[PDB]
Amino acid sequence: SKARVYTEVNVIYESLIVQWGEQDDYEVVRKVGRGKYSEVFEGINVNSKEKCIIKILKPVKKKKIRREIKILQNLCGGPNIVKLLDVVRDQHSKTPSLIFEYVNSTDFKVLYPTLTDYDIRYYIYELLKALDFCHSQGIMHRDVKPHNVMIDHELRKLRLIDWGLAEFYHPGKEYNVRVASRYFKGPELLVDLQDYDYSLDMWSLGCMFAGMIFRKEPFFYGHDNQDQLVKIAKVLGTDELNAYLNKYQLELDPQLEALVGRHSRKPWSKFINADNQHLVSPEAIDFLDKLLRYDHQDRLTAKEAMAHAYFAQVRAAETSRMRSQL
């Protein structure tokens, strides 16, 4: 199982030596969040007085650290990718820090309930730009979720952040399935299919999208990794799951097989209610349906997603803006 697109980018991060900057150029002001091996801070460039994001990495595995840096530097300038400003170190202590552009973002739990139909089409399209670019550079993000999509709603600005789980794609290579966050893990991760690709990010985006238009966050709400497959099965159905398992010659553990049980496919229209109906359209459902597929090879690519009719008005507005600016 290979990818449909960008299978030969890294055919046409260990031995990486990074160029450390001065840690005194930046100062930590406020803590905003933490990670499994990182803490994130609002900071300041004491020279330019410009705000920034400071990510101090608990020096766990330097291999993982160098990987994230190599990737971020490869994506610099890319549409809607977070911009790495600098990479600095204690010089005495081993502890490194990643310096990023500041994004005055609204937390999705507050923002998403206020999004309109136009907002959703607009921001998903901006996120797709980011995924298309990094996939074109031969990179999987592997942690797409609302927390890693920073939106400054006032500036209509979106940035894809947190590239700690990002990886270079090599065709046929078997990857760690311990990636992404539970609610946004694709079927490949849950049935231990290790030769996955860019399409993993497209499932995750599909989960986010479903969450927004149905106002159901998260959409697939498993109590654990096994229950997560069950929640997916209860919507997509078990027959397409069996075809999926057969295609890639996979077998579920008998206990997991029992939990999944048997389920018919559930029409997307079942999730429509009076509260979310203004966010839902035949175009939105068609688009969603082409993202949330068991078979990663059947999912839309980022580029194919951007050409979907759902984004017709977003494209047309851009084109009209271009002609006018000419």
PDB file of all heavy atoms in Angstrom, residues 154-190, unseen atoms left out:
ATOM      1  N   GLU A 154     -10.133  37.300  14.136  1.00  0.00           N
ATOM      2  CA  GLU A 154     -10.263  38.705  13.760  1.00  0.00           C
ATOM      3  C   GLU A 154      -9.485  38.966  12.482  1.00  0.00           C
ATOM      4  O   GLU A 154      -9.925  39.718  11.625  1.00  0.00           O
ATOM      5  CB  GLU A 154      -9.780  39.626  14.883  1.00  0.00           C
ATOM      6  CG  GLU A 154     -10.725  39.697  16.075  1.00  0.00           C
ATOM      7  CD  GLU A 154     -10.756  38.413  16.885  1.00  0.00           C
ATOM      8  OE1 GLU A 154      -9.786  37.629  16.799  1.00  0.00           O
ATOM      9  OE2 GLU A 154     -11.749  38.181  17.605  1.00  0.00           O
ATOM     10  N   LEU A 155      -8.333  38.321  12.352  1.00  0.00           N
ATOM     11  CA  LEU A 155      -7.476  38.523  11.191  1.00  0.00           C
ATOM     12  C   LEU A 155      -7.777  37.540  10.071  1.00  0.00           C
ATOM     13  O   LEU A 155      -7.123  37.575   9.025  1.00  0.00           O
ATOM     14  CB  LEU A 155      -6.007  38.403  11.584  1.00  0.00           C
ATOM     15  CG  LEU A 155      -5.288  39.684  12.000  1.00  0.00           C
ATOM     16  CD1 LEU A 155      -6.077  40.444  13.058  1.00  0.00           C
ATOM     17  CD2 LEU A 155      -3.904  39.324  12.513  1.00  0.00           C
ATOM     18  N   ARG A 156      -8.767  36.677  10.291  1.00  0.00           N
ATOM     19  CA  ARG A 156      -9.113  35.626   9.334  1.00  0.00           C
ATOM     20  C   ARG A 156      -7.862  34.816   8.992  1.00  0.00           C
ATOM     21  O   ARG A 156      -7.641  34.452   7.838  1.00  0.00           O
ATOM     22  CB  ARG A 156      -9.733  36.206   8.058  1.00  0.00           C
ATOM     23  CG  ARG A 156     -10.815  37.261   8.261  1.00  0.00           C
ATOM     24  CD  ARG A 156     -12.082  36.714   8.896  1.00  0.00           C
ATOM     25  NE  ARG A 156     -12.762  35.733   8.058  1.00  0.00           N
ATOM     26  CZ  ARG A 156     -13.874  35.098   8.414  1.00  0.00           C
ATOM     27  NH1 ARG A 156     -14.434  35.348   9.590  1.00  0.00           N
ATOM     28  NH2 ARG A 156     -14.426  34.210   7.600  1.00  0.00           N
ATOM     29  N   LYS A 157      -7.033  34.572  10.002  1.00  0.00           N
ATOM     30  CA  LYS A 157      -5.734  33.947   9.796  1.00  0.00           C
ATOM     31  C   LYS A 157      -5.662  32.571  10.446  1.00  0.00           C
ATOM     32  O   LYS A 157      -6.043  32.405  11.592  1.00  0.00           O
ATOM     33  CB  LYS A 157      -4.620  34.838  10.351  1.00  0.00           C
ATOM     34  CG  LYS A 157      -3.269  34.137  10.444  1.00  0.00           C
ATOM     35  CD  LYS A 157      -2.128  35.120  10.635  1.00  0.00           C
ATOM     36  CE  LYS A 157      -2.133  35.729  12.016  1.00  0.00           C
ATOM     37  NZ  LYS A 157      -0.946  36.605  12.223  1.00  0.00           N
ATOM     38  N   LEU A 158      -5.169  31.591   9.699  1.00  0.00           N
ATOM     39  CA  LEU A 158      -5.048  30.226  10.191  1.00  0.00           C
ATOM     40  C   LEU A 158      -3.612  29.757  10.071  1.00  0.00           C
ATOM     41  O   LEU A 158      -2.956  30.002   9.063  1.00  0.00           O
ATOM     42  CB  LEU A 158      -5.975  29.293   9.411  1.00  0.00           C
ATOM     43  CG  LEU A 158      -6.070  27.821   9.815  1.00  0.00           C
ATOM     44  CD1 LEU A 158      -7.452  27.294   9.458  1.00  0.00           C
ATOM     45  CD2 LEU A 158      -4.995  26.980   9.114  1.00  0.00           C
ATOM     46  N   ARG A 159      -3.132  29.071  11.100  1.00  0.00           N
ATOM     47  CA  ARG A 159      -1.798  28.488  11.063  1.00  0.00           C
ATOM     48  C   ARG A 159      -1.845  27.063  11.584  1.00  0.00           C
ATOM     49  O   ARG A 159      -2.457  26.794  12.617  1.00  0.00           O
ATOM     50  CB  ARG A 159      -0.820  29.321  11.891  1.00  0.00           C
ATOM     51  CG  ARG A 159      -0.614  30.731  11.372  1.00  0.00           C
ATOM     52  CD  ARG A 159       0.164  30.721  10.068  1.00  0.00           C
ATOM     53  NE  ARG A 159       0.461  32.075   9.615  1.00  0.00           N
ATOM     54  CZ  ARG A 159      -0.322  32.779   8.805  1.00  0.00           C
ATOM     55  NH1 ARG A 159      -1.450  32.260   8.354  1.00  0.00           N
ATOM     56  NH2 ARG A 159       0.026  34.006   8.446  1.00  0.00           N
ATOM     57  N   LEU A 160      -1.202  26.156  10.863  1.00  0.00           N
ATOM     58  CA  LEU A 160      -1.084  24.776  11.306  1.00  0.00           C
ATOM     59  C   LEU A 160       0.185  24.646  12.128  1.00  0.00           C
ATOM     60  O   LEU A 160       1.271  24.946  11.648  1.00  0.00           O
ATOM     61  CB  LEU A 160      -1.075  23.816  10.110  1.00  0.00           C
ATOM     62  CG  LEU A 160      -0.919  22.314  10.375  1.00  0.00           C
ATOM     63  CD1 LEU A 160      -1.950  21.819  11.389  1.00  0.00           C
ATOM     64  CD2 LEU A 160      -1.018  21.525   9.061  1.00  0.00           C
ATOM     65  N   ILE A 161       0.043  24.221  13.378  1.00  0.00           N
ATOM     66  CA  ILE A 161       1.168  24.229  14.315  1.00  0.00           C
ATOM     67  C   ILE A 161       1.483  22.837  14.862  1.00  0.00           C
ATOM     68  O   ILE A 161       0.846  21.854  14.478  1.00  0.00           O
ATOM     69  CB  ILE A 161       0.897  25.168  15.507  1.00  0.00           C
ATOM     70  CG1 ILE A 161      -0.212  24.592  16.392  1.00  0.00           C
ATOM     71  CG2 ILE A 161       0.532  26.572  15.008  1.00  0.00           C
ATOM     72  CD1 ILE A 161      -0.266  25.195  17.774  1.00  0.00           C
ATOM     73  N   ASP A 162       2.480  22.776  15.745  1.00  0.00           N
ATOM     74  CA  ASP A 162       2.827  21.564  16.492  1.00  0.00           C
ATOM     75  C   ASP A 162       3.233  20.411  15.569  1.00  0.00           C
ATOM     76  O   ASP A 162       2.487  19.450  15.373  1.00  0.00           O
ATOM     77  CB  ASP A 162       1.660  21.144  17.390  1.00  0.00           C
ATOM     78  CG  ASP A 162       2.057  20.100  18.413  1.00  0.00           C
ATOM     79  OD1 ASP A 162       3.268  19.809  18.534  1.00  0.00           O
ATOM     80  OD2 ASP A 162       1.152  19.581  19.105  1.00  0.00           O
ATOM     81  N   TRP A 163       4.440  20.514  15.025  1.00  0.00           N
ATOM     82  CA  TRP A 163       4.941  19.541  14.066  1.00  0.00           C
ATOM     83  C   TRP A 163       5.823  18.488  14.725  1.00  0.00           C
ATOM     84  O   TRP A 163       6.644  17.851  14.067  1.00  0.00           O
ATOM     85  CB  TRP A 163       5.693  20.267  12.947  1.00  0.00           C
ATOM     86  CG  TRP A 163       4.768  21.163  12.145  1.00  0.00           C
ATOM     87  CD1 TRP A 163       4.316  22.406  12.498  1.00  0.00           C
ATOM     88  CD2 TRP A 163       4.170  20.864  10.879  1.00  0.00           C
ATOM     89  NE1 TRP A 163       3.478  22.903  11.520  1.00  0.00           N
ATOM     90  CE2 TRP A 163       3.375  21.977  10.517  1.00  0.00           C
ATOM     91  CE3 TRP A 163       4.231  19.768  10.012  1.00  0.00           C
ATOM     92  CZ2 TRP A 163       2.650  22.019   9.327  1.00  0.00           C
ATOM     93  CZ3 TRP A 163       3.508  19.810   8.833  1.00  0.00           C
ATOM     94  CH2 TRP A 163       2.729  20.931   8.499  1.00  0.00           C
ATOM     95  N   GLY A 164       5.623  18.288  16.026  1.00  0.00           N
ATOM     96  CA  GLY A 164       6.382  17.308  16.790  1.00  0.00           C
ATOM     97  C   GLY A 164       6.167  15.858  16.364  1.00  0.00           C
ATOM     98  O   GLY A 164       7.037  15.020  16.557  1.00  0.00           O
ATOM     99  N   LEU A 165       5.011  15.547  15.788  1.00  0.00           N
ATOM    100  CA  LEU A 165       4.758  14.180  15.331  1.00  0.00           C
ATOM    101  C   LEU A 165       4.907  14.049  13.818  1.00  0.00           C
ATOM    102  O   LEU A 165       4.686  12.972  13.261  1.00  0.00           O
ATOM    103  CB  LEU A 165       3.365  13.709  15.754  1.00  0.00           C
ATOM    104  CG  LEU A 165       3.028  13.690  17.248  1.00  0.00           C
ATOM    105  CD1 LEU A 165       1.661  13.049  17.476  1.00  0.00           C
ATOM    106  CD2 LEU A 165       4.103  12.976  18.063  1.00  0.00           C
ATOM    107  N   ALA A 166       5.286  15.142  13.161  1.00  0.00           N
ATOM    108  CA  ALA A 166       5.462  15.142  11.709  1.00  0.00           C
ATOM    109  C   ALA A 166       6.598  14.221  11.270  1.00  0.00           C
ATOM    110  O   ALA A 166       7.588  14.024  11.996  1.00  0.00           O
ATOM    111  CB  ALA A 166       5.709  16.547  11.205  1.00  0.00           C
ATOM    112  N   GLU A 167       6.459  13.671  10.068  1.00  0.00           N
ATOM    113  CA  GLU A 167       7.415  12.700   9.555  1.00  0.00           C
ATOM    114  C   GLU A 167       7.514  12.799   8.041  1.00  0.00           C
ATOM    115  O   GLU A 167       6.550  13.172   7.381  1.00  0.00           O
ATOM    116  CB  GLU A 167       7.010  11.284   9.975  1.00  0.00           C
ATOM    117  CG  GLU A 167       7.936  10.186   9.492  1.00  0.00           C
ATOM    118  CD  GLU A 167       9.340  10.328  10.046  1.00  0.00           C
ATOM    119  OE1 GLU A 167       9.603   9.778  11.136  1.00  0.00           O
ATOM    120  OE2 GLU A 167      10.175  10.993   9.400  1.00  0.00           O
ATOM    121  N   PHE A 168       8.687  12.483   7.498  1.00  0.00           N
ATOM    122  CA  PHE A 168       8.875  12.422   6.056  1.00  0.00           C
ATOM    123  C   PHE A 168       8.252  11.135   5.513  1.00  0.00           C
ATOM    124  O   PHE A 168       8.426  10.065   6.100  1.00  0.00           O
ATOM    125  CB  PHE A 168      10.368  12.484   5.701  1.00  0.00           C
ATOM    126  CG  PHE A 168      11.020  13.800   6.031  1.00  0.00           C
ATOM    127  CD1 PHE A 168      11.672  13.984   7.239  1.00  0.00           C
ATOM    128  CD2 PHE A 168      10.985  14.850   5.131  1.00  0.00           C
ATOM    129  CE1 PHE A 168      12.272  15.196   7.541  1.00  0.00           C
ATOM    130  CE2 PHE A 168      11.584  16.067   5.429  1.00  0.00           C
ATOM    131  CZ  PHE A 168      12.227  16.239   6.631  1.00  0.00           C
ATOM    132  N   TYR A 169       7.525  11.226   4.400  1.00  0.00           N
ATOM    133  CA  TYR A 169       6.933  10.020   3.823  1.00  0.00           C
ATOM    134  C   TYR A 169       7.878   9.304   2.875  1.00  0.00           C
ATOM    135  O   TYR A 169       8.450   9.908   1.967  1.00  0.00           O
ATOM    136  CB  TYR A 169       5.625  10.328   3.092  1.00  0.00           C
ATOM    137  CG  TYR A 169       5.043   9.094   2.434  1.00  0.00           C
ATOM    138  CD1 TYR A 169       4.448   8.096   3.192  1.00  0.00           C
ATOM    139  CD2 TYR A 169       5.115   8.915   1.057  1.00  0.00           C
ATOM    140  CE1 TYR A 169       3.929   6.958   2.599  1.00  0.00           C
ATOM    141  CE2 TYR A 169       4.601   7.782   0.456  1.00  0.00           C
ATOM    142  CZ  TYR A 169       4.006   6.807   1.227  1.00  0.00           C
ATOM    143  OH  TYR A 169       3.490   5.674   0.628  1.00  0.00           O
ATOM    144  N   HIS A 170       8.044   8.008   3.112  1.00  0.00           N
ATOM    145  CA  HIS A 170       8.774   7.119   2.214  1.00  0.00           C
ATOM    146  C   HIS A 170       7.855   5.958   1.854  1.00  0.00           C
ATOM    147  O   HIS A 170       7.315   5.297   2.744  1.00  0.00           O
ATOM    148  CB  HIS A 170      10.058   6.588   2.858  1.00  0.00           C
ATOM    149  CG  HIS A 170      11.038   7.651   3.241  1.00  0.00           C
ATOM    150  ND1 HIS A 170      11.123   8.160   4.519  1.00  0.00           N
ATOM    151  CD2 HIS A 170      11.984   8.294   2.517  1.00  0.00           C
ATOM    152  CE1 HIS A 170      12.075   9.076   4.564  1.00  0.00           C
ATOM    153  NE2 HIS A 170      12.612   9.177   3.363  1.00  0.00           N
ATOM    154  N   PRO A 171       7.676   5.698   0.551  1.00  0.00           N
ATOM    155  CA  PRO A 171       6.707   4.693   0.094  1.00  0.00           C
ATOM    156  C   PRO A 171       7.019   3.272   0.568  1.00  0.00           C
ATOM    157  O   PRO A 171       8.129   2.772   0.371  1.00  0.00           O
ATOM    158  CB  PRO A 171       6.801   4.790  -1.433  1.00  0.00           C
ATOM    159  CG  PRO A 171       8.175   5.318  -1.687  1.00  0.00           C
ATOM    160  CD  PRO A 171       8.436   6.282  -0.566  1.00  0.00           C
ATOM    161  N   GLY A 172       6.033   2.632   1.189  1.00  0.00           N
ATOM    162  CA  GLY A 172       6.181   1.265   1.650  1.00  0.00           C
ATOM    163  C   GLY A 172       6.726   1.168   3.061  1.00  0.00           C
ATOM    164  O   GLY A 172       6.658   0.111   3.689  1.00  0.00           O
ATOM    165  N   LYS A 173       7.271   2.275   3.560  1.00  0.00           N
ATOM    166  CA  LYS A 173       7.832   2.314   4.904  1.00  0.00           C
ATOM    167  C   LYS A 173       6.745   2.112   5.952  1.00  0.00           C
ATOM    168  O   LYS A 173       5.665   2.684   5.855  1.00  0.00           O
ATOM    169  CB  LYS A 173       8.560   3.640   5.149  1.00  0.00           C
ATOM    170  CG  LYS A 173       9.143   3.772   6.552  1.00  0.00           C
ATOM    171  CD  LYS A 173       9.984   5.027   6.705  1.00  0.00           C
ATOM    172  N   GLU A 174       7.037   1.290   6.952  1.00  0.00           N
ATOM    173  CA  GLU A 174       6.097   1.046   8.037  1.00  0.00           C
ATOM    174  C   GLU A 174       6.328   2.045   9.167  1.00  0.00           C
ATOM    175  O   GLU A 174       7.430   2.137   9.706  1.00  0.00           O
ATOM    176  CB  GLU A 174       6.234  -0.388   8.547  1.00  0.00           C
ATOM    177  CG  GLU A 174       6.108  -1.440   7.453  1.00  0.00           C
ATOM    178  CD  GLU A 174       6.492  -2.826   7.932  1.00  0.00           C
ATOM    179  OE1 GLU A 174       5.736  -3.409   8.735  1.00  0.00           O
ATOM    180  OE2 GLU A 174       7.555  -3.330   7.512  1.00  0.00           O
ATOM    181  N   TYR A 175       5.286   2.793   9.519  1.00  0.00           N
ATOM    182  CA  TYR A 175       5.410   3.851  10.517  1.00  0.00           C
ATOM    183  C   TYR A 175       4.794   3.485  11.865  1.00  0.00           C
ATOM    184  O   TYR A 175       3.996   2.552  11.973  1.00  0.00           O
ATOM    185  CB  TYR A 175       4.772   5.146  10.004  1.00  0.00           C
ATOM    186  CG  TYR A 175       5.481   5.735   8.814  1.00  0.00           C
ATOM    187  CD1 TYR A 175       5.092   5.409   7.520  1.00  0.00           C
ATOM    188  CD2 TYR A 175       6.547   6.608   8.980  1.00  0.00           C
ATOM    189  CE1 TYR A 175       5.742   5.935   6.427  1.00  0.00           C
ATOM    190  CE2 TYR A 175       7.203   7.141   7.889  1.00  0.00           C
ATOM    191  CZ  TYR A 175       6.797   6.799   6.617  1.00  0.00           C
ATOM    192  OH  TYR A 175       7.445   7.324   5.525  1.00  0.00           O
ATOM    193  N   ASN A 176       5.189   4.234  12.890  1.00  0.00           N
ATOM    194  CA  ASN A 176       4.609   4.114  14.221  1.00  0.00           C
ATOM    195  C   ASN A 176       3.133   4.500  14.207  1.00  0.00           C
ATOM    196  O   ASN A 176       2.775   5.570  13.710  1.00  0.00           O
ATOM    197  CB  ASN A 176       5.382   4.994  15.203  1.00  0.00           C
ATOM    198  CG  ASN A 176       4.773   5.003  16.587  1.00  0.00           C
ATOM    199  OD1 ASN A 176       4.178   4.019  17.020  1.00  0.00           O
ATOM    200  ND2 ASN A 176       4.916   6.121  17.290  1.00  0.00           N
ATOM    201  N   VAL A 177       2.273   3.640  14.742  1.00  0.00           N
ATOM    202  CA  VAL A 177       0.843   3.940  14.742  1.00  0.00           C
ATOM    203  C   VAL A 177       0.452   4.743  15.972  1.00  0.00           C
ATOM    204  O   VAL A 177      -0.700   5.148  16.115  1.00  0.00           O
ATOM    205  CB  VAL A 177      -0.014   2.669  14.684  1.00  0.00           C
ATOM    206  CG1 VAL A 177       0.359   1.835  13.459  1.00  0.00           C
ATOM    207  CG2 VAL A 177       0.144   1.874  15.962  1.00  0.00           C
ATOM    208  N   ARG A 178       1.416   4.975  16.856  1.00  0.00           N
ATOM    209  CA  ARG A 178       1.181   5.789  18.042  1.00  0.00           C
ATOM    210  C   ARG A 178       1.311   7.276  17.711  1.00  0.00           C
ATOM    211  O   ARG A 178       2.099   7.992  18.329  1.00  0.00           O
ATOM    212  CB  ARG A 178       2.149   5.402  19.162  1.00  0.00           C
ATOM    213  N   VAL A 179       0.536   7.729  16.727  1.00  0.00           N
ATOM    214  CA  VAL A 179       0.527   9.132  16.326  1.00  0.00           C
ATOM    215  C   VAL A 179      -0.892   9.701  16.416  1.00  0.00           C
ATOM    216  O   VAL A 179      -1.847   8.961  16.659  1.00  0.00           O
ATOM    217  CB  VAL A 179       1.063   9.329  14.890  1.00  0.00           C
ATOM    218  CG1 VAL A 179       2.508   8.877  14.786  1.00  0.00           C
ATOM    219  CG2 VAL A 179       0.181   8.584  13.877  1.00  0.00           C
ATOM    220  N   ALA A 180      -1.013  11.014  16.221  1.00  0.00           N
ATOM    221  CA  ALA A 180      -2.292  11.729  16.298  1.00  0.00           C
ATOM    222  C   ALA A 180      -2.970  11.596  17.667  1.00  0.00           C
ATOM    223  O   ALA A 180      -2.510  10.864  18.534  1.00  0.00           O
ATOM    224  CB  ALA A 180      -3.233  11.247  15.189  1.00  0.00           C
ATOM    225  N   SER A 181      -4.054  12.336  17.862  1.00  0.00           N
ATOM    226  CA  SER A 181      -4.814  12.261  19.105  1.00  0.00           C
ATOM    227  C   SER A 181      -6.022  11.362  18.905  1.00  0.00           C
ATOM    228  O   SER A 181      -6.577  11.311  17.813  1.00  0.00           O
ATOM    229  CB  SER A 181      -5.244  13.653  19.564  1.00  0.00           C
ATOM    230  OG  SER A 181      -4.111  14.465  19.810  1.00  0.00           O
ATOM    231  N   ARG A 182      -6.418  10.666  19.967  1.00  0.00           N
ATOM    232  CA  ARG A 182      -7.437   9.610  19.899  1.00  0.00           C
ATOM    233  C   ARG A 182      -8.631   9.880  18.980  1.00  0.00           C
ATOM    234  O   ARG A 182      -8.974   9.049  18.141  1.00  0.00           O
ATOM    235  CB  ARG A 182      -7.974   9.307  21.294  1.00  0.00           C
ATOM    236  CG  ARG A 182      -9.017   8.212  21.296  1.00  0.00           C
ATOM    237  CD  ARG A 182      -9.630   8.041  22.663  1.00  0.00           C
ATOM    238  NE  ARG A 182      -8.623   7.742  23.673  1.00  0.00           N
ATOM    239  CZ  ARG A 182      -8.785   7.974  24.970  1.00  0.00           C
ATOM    240  NH1 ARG A 182      -9.915   8.515  25.411  1.00  0.00           N
ATOM    241  NH2 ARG A 182      -7.815   7.673  25.821  1.00  0.00           N
ATOM    242  N   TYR A 183      -9.263  11.036  19.136  1.00  0.00           N
ATOM    243  CA  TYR A 183     -10.493  11.318  18.392  1.00  0.00           C
ATOM    244  C   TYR A 183     -10.256  11.525  16.896  1.00  0.00           C
ATOM    245  O   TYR A 183     -11.193  11.517  16.107  1.00  0.00           O
ATOM    246  CB  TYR A 183     -11.190  12.547  18.985  1.00  0.00           C
ATOM    247  CG  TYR A 183     -11.380  12.451  20.481  1.00  0.00           C
ATOM    248  CD1 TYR A 183     -11.149  13.552  21.309  1.00  0.00           C
ATOM    249  CD2 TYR A 183     -11.770  11.255  21.073  1.00  0.00           C
ATOM    250  CE1 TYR A 183     -11.316  13.463  22.685  1.00  0.00           C
ATOM    251  CE2 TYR A 183     -11.936  11.158  22.447  1.00  0.00           C
ATOM    252  CZ  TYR A 183     -11.709  12.266  23.246  1.00  0.00           C
ATOM    253  OH  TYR A 183     -11.878  12.169  24.607  1.00  0.00           O
ATOM    254  N   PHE A 184      -8.997  11.692  16.506  1.00  0.00           N
ATOM    255  CA  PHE A 184      -8.664  12.055  15.131  1.00  0.00           C
ATOM    256  C   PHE A 184      -7.773  11.013  14.468  1.00  0.00           C
ATOM    257  O   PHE A 184      -7.307  11.198  13.349  1.00  0.00           O
ATOM    258  CB  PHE A 184      -8.007  13.434  15.121  1.00  0.00           C
ATOM    259  CG  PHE A 184      -8.834  14.466  15.815  1.00  0.00           C
ATOM    260  CD1 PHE A 184      -8.641  14.730  17.160  1.00  0.00           C
ATOM    261  CD2 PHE A 184      -9.853  15.122  15.139  1.00  0.00           C
ATOM    262  CE1 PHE A 184      -9.424  15.655  17.816  1.00  0.00           C
ATOM    263  CE2 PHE A 184     -10.641  16.044  15.796  1.00  0.00           C
ATOM    264  CZ  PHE A 184     -10.425  16.302  17.140  1.00  0.00           C
ATOM    265  N   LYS A 185      -7.546   9.918  15.179  1.00  0.00           N
ATOM    266  CA  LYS A 185      -6.864   8.749  14.645  1.00  0.00           C
ATOM    267  C   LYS A 185      -7.697   8.097  13.548  1.00  0.00           C
ATOM    268  O   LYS A 185      -8.872   7.793  13.756  1.00  0.00           O
ATOM    269  CB  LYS A 185      -6.608   7.728  15.751  1.00  0.00           C
ATOM    270  CG  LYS A 185      -5.552   8.109  16.776  1.00  0.00           C
ATOM    271  CD  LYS A 185      -5.519   7.057  17.881  1.00  0.00           C
ATOM    272  CE  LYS A 185      -4.453   7.358  18.911  1.00  0.00           C
ATOM    273  NZ  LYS A 185      -3.088   7.204  18.348  1.00  0.00           N
ATOM    274  N   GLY A 186      -7.086   7.878  12.388  1.00  0.00           N
ATOM    275  CA  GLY A 186      -7.751   7.174  11.310  1.00  0.00           C
ATOM    276  C   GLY A 186      -7.746   5.680  11.561  1.00  0.00           C
ATOM    277  O   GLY A 186      -6.971   5.196  12.390  1.00  0.00           O
ATOM    278  N   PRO A 187      -8.614   4.947  10.849  1.00  0.00           N
ATOM    279  CA  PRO A 187      -8.737   3.487  10.899  1.00  0.00           C
ATOM    280  C   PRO A 187      -7.396   2.768  10.778  1.00  0.00           C
ATOM    281  O   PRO A 187      -7.202   1.758  11.440  1.00  0.00           O
ATOM    282  CB  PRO A 187      -9.629   3.171   9.692  1.00  0.00           C
ATOM    283  CG  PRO A 187     -10.454   4.374   9.525  1.00  0.00           C
ATOM    284  CD  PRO A 187      -9.595   5.547   9.926  1.00  0.00           C
ATOM    285  N   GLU A 188      -6.493   3.281   9.947  1.00  0.00           N
ATOM    286  CA  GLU A 188      -5.196   2.642   9.748  1.00  0.00           C
ATOM    287  C   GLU A 188      -4.451   2.525  11.067  1.00  0.00           C
ATOM    288  O   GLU A 188      -3.831   1.499  11.351  1.00  0.00           O
ATOM    289  CB  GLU A 188      -4.343   3.411   8.730  1.00  0.00           C
ATOM    290  CG  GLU A 188      -4.255   4.921   8.956  1.00  0.00           C
ATOM    291  CD  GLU A 188      -5.334   5.693   8.208  1.00  0.00           C
ATOM    292  OE1 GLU A 188      -6.534   5.466   8.478  1.00  0.00           O
ATOM    293  OE2 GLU A 188      -4.977   6.529   7.345  1.00  0.00           O
ATOM    294  N   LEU A 189      -4.534   3.577  11.874  1.00  0.00           N
ATOM    295  CA  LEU A 189      -3.869   3.605  13.166  1.00  0.00           C
ATOM    296  C   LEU A 189      -4.527   2.637  14.140  1.00  0.00           C
ATOM    297  O   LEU A 189      -3.866   2.077  15.002  1.00  0.00           O
ATOM    298  CB  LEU A 189      -3.884   5.021  13.745  1.00  0.00           C
ATOM    299  CG  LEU A 189      -3.261   6.078  12.839  1.00  0.00           C
ATOM    300  CD1 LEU A 189      -3.314   7.428  13.520  1.00  0.00           C
ATOM    301  CD2 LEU A 189      -1.833   5.715  12.499  1.00  0.00           C
ATOM    302  N   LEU A 190      -5.832   2.433  13.985  1.00  0.00           N
ATOM    303  CA  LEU A 190      -6.598   1.644  14.944  1.00  0.00           C
ATOM    304  C   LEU A 190      -6.591   0.143  14.629  1.00  0.00           C
ATOM    305  O   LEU A 190      -6.858  -0.674  15.505  1.00  0.00           O
ATOM    306  CB  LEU A 190      -8.035   2.152  15.004  1.00  0.00           C
ATOM    307  CG  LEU A 190      -8.175   3.615  15.432  1.00  0.00           C
ATOM    308  CD1 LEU A 190      -9.618   4.056  15.291  1.00  0.00           C
ATOM    309  CD2 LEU A 190      -7.678   3.791  16.882  1.00  0.00           C
TER     310      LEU A 190
END
